[PDB]
Amino acid sequence: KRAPSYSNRGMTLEDDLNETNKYYLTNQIAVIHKKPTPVQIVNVHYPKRSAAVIKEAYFKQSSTTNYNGIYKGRYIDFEAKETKNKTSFPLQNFHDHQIEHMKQVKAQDGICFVIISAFDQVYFLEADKLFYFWDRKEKNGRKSIRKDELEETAYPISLGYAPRIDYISIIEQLYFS
Amino acid sequence: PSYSNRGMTLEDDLNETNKYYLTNQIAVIHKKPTPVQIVNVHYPKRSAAVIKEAYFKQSSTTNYNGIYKGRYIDFEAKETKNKTSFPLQNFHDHQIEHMKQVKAQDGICFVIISAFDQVYFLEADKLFYFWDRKEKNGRKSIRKDELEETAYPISLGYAPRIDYISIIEQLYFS
DNA sequence: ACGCAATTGCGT
DNA sequence: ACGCAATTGCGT
DNA sequence: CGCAATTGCGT
DNA sequence: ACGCAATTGCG
């Protein structure tokens, strides 16, 4: 975990949203965790007593959205994606299943959405809109959302110290009067 | 090899009950996968990139969850064979803390154990209790019969095997 | 898997 | 007709 | 992250 | 000294 580097604009990294979650944790505001990345652990070894060191394992494509949890007894689910492209946000770094799921997750009523970090700016795009840009892609046409319609389609978030990323104050400002 | 015991694992049995649930739009539940910290990933051009060394960590979050009917659902699934009693040695402190936070936030928070050839849907407060007594250097287990009213026997069926959705359907919101 | 170099192709 | 925004893809 | 072994409580 | 209960050890 000794990573001397290297800057993004910005994850950043688990530090950015992650710290926000811990904070939300220890102030009894919400329980939101990042579902961990699903490996298929083909081969493990057990050297020198404990502990184990998987010698061969492969990456699986997830099926669920990146983050989930509880706020005010409601379900929270969301993906977070960031881009350095100064012009637009690549819709292509979303993937099939994630969207299938956001769909199913909004099936029963949930707060399902997307946090986007691009244009030196963290944005909160509701899942609705995202679904528009998705089948805009899906019929045919633009595989990205240009800024002037990301800013036009999404709510900007305020990035401070402390909650670093304060998405709950939007989910509050919007789904809870 | 996916099941190296005498009694069925409860791994598949539950995460199949979940598939049914999903496919029929009854509700959305998914097991959080096991956390591992990757260390090295060799990446051939053809072969999919092989993670060649990696280590387990141990997540706090109680390892099932999702949505049902607009309300955040959560639980755990331990499973014990011994007909003796059921050992709290399975659940850890962090898990308990977590699902403490959860019910501290209007969460619905089962505990599912398939002990004694039966599937026990165990409400949270009751588990807390056992863990509490236990924390007072008391009974480090739940004896075979004391859960038997502390907990509900889930309705083990065929379409959805260890149907618990309707237990939670019954308590809340009716 | 991802950044990020390569490459496409829209736009005017 | 050519630039520079959108995409593809190849490389640790 | 388990089932085979260990030991201790307690008729 | 067993059922039954708790606790090392590495497959």
Side-chain angles (χ1 to χ4, degrees), chain A residues 64 66 77-78 80-82 88-90 92-99 101-102 104-106 111-117 123-130 132-137 141-145 149-150 154-155 175:
Chain A
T64 312
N66 289 104
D77 207 280
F78 64 94
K81 255 106 194 159
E82 65 172 318
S88 180
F89 178 68
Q92 306 147 57
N93 59 357
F94 270 95
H95 276 55
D96 45 320
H97 291 143
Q98 287 151 329
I99 305 261
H101 182 119
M102 298 192 220
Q104 307 145 338
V105 168
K106 269 273 200 288
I111 308 178
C112 171
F113 65 104
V114 186
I115 298 166
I116 304 87
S117 164
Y123 285 112
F124 177 80
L125 182 79
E126 183 61 28
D128 292 337
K129 332 300 301 174
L130 176 73
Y132 174 31
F133 306 103
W134 197 258
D135 64 9
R136 196 174 77 184
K137 147 152 185 312
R142 202 178 184 114
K143 307 200 195 69
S144 297
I145 295 173
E149 63 185 342
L150 177 57
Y155 302 95
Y175 280 77

Side-chain angles (χ1 to χ4, degrees), chain B residues 1 7 9-10 12-18 20-25 27-30 33-36 41-42 44 48-49 54-56 58-60 63-66 68-77 79-80 84-99 101-102 104-109 111-118 120-134 138 141 143 145-149 151-153 155 157 159-161 163-167 170-173:
Chain B
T9 303
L10 177 63
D12 206 39
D13 281 89
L14 250 189
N15 64 34
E16 218 293 329
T17 302
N18 300 283
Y20 173 111
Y21 277 148
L22 190 51
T23 73
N24 283 119
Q25 304 291 86
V28 179
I29 300 297
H30 290 301
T34 288
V36 320
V41 189
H42 162 45
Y55 312 87
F56 293 60
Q58 175 219 89
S59 63
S60 49
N63 58 31
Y64 281 84
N65 70 336
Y68 171 55
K69 298 292 180 65
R71 263 199 90 122
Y72 175 97
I73 261 46
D74 195 318
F75 49 82
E76 187 74 17
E79 167 61 336
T80 294
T84 60
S85 65
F86 171 82
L88 281 180
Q89 193 210 17
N90 290 327
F91 313 150
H92 297 10
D93 305 332
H94 43 77
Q95 294 177 335
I96 265 65
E97 176 62 12
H98 168 271
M99 48 192 291
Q101 301 272 27
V102 175
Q105 206 100 16
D106 199 81
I108 287 163
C109 184
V111 154
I112 295 169
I113 61 171
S114 179
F116 319 136
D117 291 338
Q118 192 118 31
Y120 289 96
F121 173 93
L122 180 82
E123 186 45 86
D125 295 311
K126 326 266 187 154
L127 173 65
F128 291 146
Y129 169 97
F130 289 87
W131 190 258
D132 197 322
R133 183 167 98 185
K134 191 234 89 176
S141 296
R143 270 180 44 253
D145 61 320
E146 50 177 2
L147 63 80
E148 297 186 339
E149 166 63 321
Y152 295 89
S155 179
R161 307 205 213 182
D163 174 24
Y164 52 85
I165 208 75
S166 178
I167 283 84
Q170 275 208 12
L171 275 293
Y172 334 71
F173 203 175

Side-chain angles (χ1 to χ4, degrees), chain A residues 42 44 46-47 51-52 57-59 61-64 66-69 71-72:
Chain A
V42 178
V44 54
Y46 296 75
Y58 298 84
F59 279 96
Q61 154 82 27
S62 64
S63 47
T64 312
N66 289 104
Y67 289 86
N68 63 347
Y71 177 89
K72 300 292 187 33

